[PDB]
Each structure stands twice: as structure tokens, then as C-alpha cells.
Amino acid sequence: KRKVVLAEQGSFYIGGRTVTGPGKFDPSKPVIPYSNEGATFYINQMYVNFQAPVRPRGLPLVFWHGGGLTGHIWESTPDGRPGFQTLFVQDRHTVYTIDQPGRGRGNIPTFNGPFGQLEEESIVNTVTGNSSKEGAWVRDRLGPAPGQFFENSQFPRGYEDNYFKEMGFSPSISSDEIVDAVVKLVTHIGPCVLVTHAASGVLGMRVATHAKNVRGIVAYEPATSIFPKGKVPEIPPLADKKSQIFPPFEIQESYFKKLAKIPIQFVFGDNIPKNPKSAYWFLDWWRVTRYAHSLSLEAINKLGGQASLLDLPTAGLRGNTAFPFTDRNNVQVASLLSDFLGKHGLDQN
Amino acid sequence: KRKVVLAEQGSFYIGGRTVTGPGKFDPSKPVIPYSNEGATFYINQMYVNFQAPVRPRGLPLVFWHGGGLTGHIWESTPDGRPGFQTLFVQDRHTVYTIDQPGRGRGNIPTFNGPFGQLEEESIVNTVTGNSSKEGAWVRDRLGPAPGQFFENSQFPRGYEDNYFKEMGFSPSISSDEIVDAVVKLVTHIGPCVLVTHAASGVLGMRVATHAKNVRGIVAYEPATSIFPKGKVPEIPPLADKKSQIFPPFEIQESYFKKLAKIPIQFVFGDNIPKNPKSAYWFLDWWRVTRYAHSLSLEAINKLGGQASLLDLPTAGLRGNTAFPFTDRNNVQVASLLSDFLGKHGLDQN
Ligand SMILES: COC(=O)c1ccccc1S(=O)(=O)NC(=O)Nc1nc(C)cc(C)n1
Ligand SMILES: COC(=O)c1ccccc1S(=O)(=O)NC(=O)Nc1nc(C)cc(C)n1
């Protein structure tokens, strides 16, 4: 159960670009304090870790953390149980885990000067945003309010400090450049499966439309829905009559159609309400967001697709949060992922 | 051999504190855009990865990256060869790699507002500093000027982009809080050996004075020297007759004396000039910095210690950069680390 046998492991950087400061670099002049003079900076590169089993079977999996997270969430649960990285190497797949540009070991583009600014150019915004513990608690559906847990909870209660410590801010790197780095990784790896989460859901759908090597997608609790341009369906506002879900991403139909060529599964945990819930903003947000995803999957299927929505409670798993792959039943969640890979032959050579 | 057999692996967060925004959190109100209202933020925590072999021998090793780096540098070289993590798990040690607070998967303390600012409080400075490619090239002694290599260089040429992509800024978290996180890790681990690098050199020395579990230190190319308070020896300026090395860190002699109780080795690569070199600021900086460290080690030995300076060229290894553990001969560098561990019984149970 904890033992893992690796034919090889390692990490590397991929993607990104360079930006430059003014002037020329003189090696005879004091190098410290650092200057933008004569400077070349590498920005927006992505960190990638890989672990390959002996005699892998089927396609490599690329695990893509959600918003404000890192590859840690696939390594271990907050209470130190094996994450999906270990579980899937044991299941004979080569496993890639990434820290996308702007997160963890990915690049945070800043220089000498106010955060994100290279002389007169704003690479990323100096003003940041970041969730609180309280905002994350309700976002991830630990309970309806901070400190509270849903009755059926699979959260590793007692490890709240570990869990919230894994979360942080993201600088304003364009989503285009985040997608670009993962497209480059997919080109490097070859045929593979993307396993996404929350904010990376929409990004992985975009990658698949740019990269035929994506042979399947499993998206845990995706945060933003995707539709063909001009064909976003009517989506209701939230129960507070004022808020809405995240504006759906729209792509050209030629690209959207590529989503119909591969198996796609969206996976949702528990405690998303059926009915409007004005007292709990994020619970209601999830209700309408899941609804929008159901319509997005239907649009894919009408174009010939193989898109499905898996509600974990319907599979007999109760109490999952928005991070089902780190919950107490994450081994059963992993079993359902293995089932999907087996159904489509993505676990065979 | 790239193969590794792990009895267990994983990662966790340790250390840090919390800061709070004003006001109250209302779950009925829109949670996004994120707000500091009612907010608790976890700040300055550290990420820790571990890999344990089957039947470990001796003490666990804690690999601590240098300035602007992450645990990536111990995982793989820029050209994809195994890093010290793999080499030492194969050498039957449990291996811990960290991303210290402010770097990689460690926390970057920022909120909703200008970078590093929580309402009226500056947690870290909004203005950042960061080396350029050019500054890092000369800092790490790839050659005397950017784009030029020493003839004897052990750097993995052709993988320059990959190498510089691993480097980034650090927010202004106090060194006290970085040391605090590692002291807490050392308390958690038990007896262990610190393996440091550059900026982490002085920090590891400080950790040892606070944590009796540190049973040995190997420091690759440490950047800041350490002395008892009031006993900093005369250190010359640089050849430019204007610049100085990093101000040596001073600690109370009762803490400094703890450094005499454990074996300590500082390891330096090649191409550090013996004589004043005014044309090449960072080469001359290393000349005087290495000299200051020699004096520091001497001070430890005058207190009954066992502190040594290992110049890799004297051991038959030519051309090493300031990252000997990722250079082309990093297996031979690793062998010298094994030799130190074996001499001092740190590879025995
Ligand atoms: C792991 O949890 C999630 O991934 C996740 C899950 C659900 C919702 C949101 C996220 S998030 O963290 O990615 N946060 C954001 O998307 N931030 C954000 N989005 C918009 C549209 C506007 C603003 C101001 N902030
Ligand atoms: C990997 O390379 C190094 O670690 C490394 C190696 C040599 C010199 C500097 C660094 S650095 O990157 O840490 N850069 C810094 O800016 N450090 C620093 N600067 C000041 C002004 C004071 C102090 C104490 N440290």
C-alpha cells in the first residue's frame, strides 16, 4: 500500500518565454543587489514531475491541480495517506504531476521593482487576490459554513491546517500561456490522459482541442463550463437573484468538435444542493455550475461525443468534498478512475 | 541506474502562522471575488517531500535548496539525470527535500490587495528583487561572463534554458521564520543531517544551533559566513575596493558553540580565483566569501569542533559550478558526500 517501485523518476521545466530589461550586463560591476539592467528573465515556465513504474500498461496520466494548488494534492492527502500519484503508479501508469505557470514550482513572473513589473511593462498585476481559509472551506464543500462539516463527510477531519496550508495565490498569467505550457508537455509525452480539477477543468478541455495526444479527460469538480461560441444556453442566476456562475468559456465550433472525439468524464462529489440555496452562496454556485456542465456535456454528445457526468453518490460514495482524490475514501475514488480508463482501453498497451 | 524502490513517499506542510483580515465572514454573501473580510490566511508554511527506502540505514538527509530555488534541484539535473534524491535513496537513506517558506510549494504570503499587503500591514514587501539569467550565470560560475563557459566546466551545456527556468524570486519573509520552519521539521524528523546550498548555508548553521537533532552539516558553496557576536575577523573588500561580501551573520557564542559538537563540511567547486579579480565581480566575490568561510570554520575548530573545507579540485574533480550536485560529475560529488556520512557514522543505525 505505501510501497512504490519506480523504473525512473524526475522533474523538468517546460514552456515559457523570456523578457528583457534595458541595457547591457557588465560582469565587472556589482551583481548584487540585482538589477534589470542587461537582464534576461525566463517567465511563465511550468514544473513537471514524473514517476514511471516498471512495465507500464496504458497511457501516462497527467494530473493537473486546481486553482491555487500544486502537485502536492496528488502526492499525499492532508493526513498523509497516499495520493493518486502513488495509487496510479501502483496501477501501472506513468504519472506526471505539474505545477502550472504561476503556482508552486512553476514560475512567478516578477523582477526588480513592484511585483510583476519589468520597468514599464506589467507582466502580471501588482494587486493580487487570494482565498481565505473561510472562503476555501465553503468553496470545497467541507460544510456550509466554516468550522462546520456535512454529516456524511469524507474530509480528513483534524488535518485542516495541513489542507489549507497547501493553497495560495495565482498571479495574473494569461490562461492562454497556461494552456500553452500544457500543450507543449502533451506534445513531449505523446498520447496521454488529462486528470483535471476545479480551475484546471476548463484549461484541460482547451488543451484537448489543441492537442490530439489527449486521448481522454477526467475532470474532478470543474469550475468553468465550456460551450461553442454563440451557443451558450440560458443559465440561471444564483438564488440571491444577483450573482452568477463563472462566465462560460466559448470556443470556435471547429475546436469544440474535437472534444467529441475522446472519452470525457466529469466527476462531482456530495452535498451539491438540488434546489436553490440562498443562505449558502457556494453551495448554490455549485448547483448552477454543475447544471451548466451537464449542458456542456450534452452539447458534446450532440456532436457525436462520449461525455458523461459521474455523481459519486450515485456510485455509492457519500460525503465527498470538492477534492475527492484527497478525501478519506480516495482509494474508492481512484477505483472509479481505473474503471473509466479500463472501459476505454486507456490501461492497455 | 534510474530505478528506485520506496517503502513510502509523500509530502506535507509544516510550520507557518496565521494572519487575519478585518471583519466577519458571511457564507450567504458572494465568496468570489475573494475578500480579506473575515479572513484567516495561513502564511510562511513550508512544503516537505520525503522518500524512504526499504531498510534505511543511518540518519535521514534533509536537502535544502539555495536562494531562489526549490527541491527540484535535488530531484533531477537540468539535462534530466538523477539528482541527489534518487542517488541517496539508492544509498539507503531516507531523503527529505523541502521548498522553504517563500519558494516553490512553500507559501508566498499575499492577499487581496497590493502584493504582500494585508490591509495596512506589510507582511512582505511589494517591491521584489530577482536575479537575471546573466547575474545567475556569473553567480554560479558557469563562466566569467554570460554565455561563456570555463573550458573545464562540468555544467550540462545545452540545457541552459532548463537550468535558469528553475530559479525565481523570494518575497521578504524574515530569515527567522525560515529557520523556524526547518527547526520544526527537524523536531518532527528526529536526528538527521542537513545538506545545504548557497543561501541555505547560513540558515542551516542557525538551525543546528537551535536543534540538537542536526547531527551533521554538508554545505555546498554557502553564501553567507557566520561568526560569534563581536568576533567577526577582518575581511577584505573586493578587488574593486568598493564592494564587500555579504555581511557575516553573528550569533551569541553560547549558540555558536553548538556548531563544535557535530561534523561540518563546506564544499566548494572550481574556478574560484586565488588572486584579486577586478574584471569579474562574482568570481572575486567567491574568492573573498570562501576566505571568510575558512575563518568561520577555524573559529568552530578553536571551540573543539570538527569543521572542514573541501575544495573539489583537491579531490580530483575539476570544473564544478556552484551547483556541484547537478553538474555532469554529480555522481562523483555524491560519492564524496557518502564518504563524509560514512566517516562520521551517519550511514549506520
Ligand atoms: C481548488 O478550487 C478551485 O480551483 C475553484 C473552484 C471553484 C471556484 C473557484 C475556484 S478558484 O480557486 O480557481 N478561484 C477562482 O477561480 N478565482 C476567481 N475566478 C474568477 C472568475 C474571478 C475571480 C476574481 N477569482
Ligand atoms: C543559488 O544561489 C544563491 O543562493 C546565492 C549564491 C551567492 C550569492 C547570492 C545568492 S542568492 O541567490 O541567495 N541571492 C541573494 O540575493 N542573496 C542575498 N542577498 C543579500 C543582499 C543578502 C543575503 C543574505 N543574501
Automatic annotation (TrEMBL), chains A, B:
PROSITE patterns: TAT. Keywords: Hydrolase. The keyword Hydrolase applies. GO terms for molecular function: hydrolase activity. Its EC number is 3.1.1.-. The keyword Hydrolase applies. Residues 61-296 form the AB hydrolase-1 domain. This is Alpha/beta fold hydrolase. It comes from Hansschlegelia zhihuaiae.
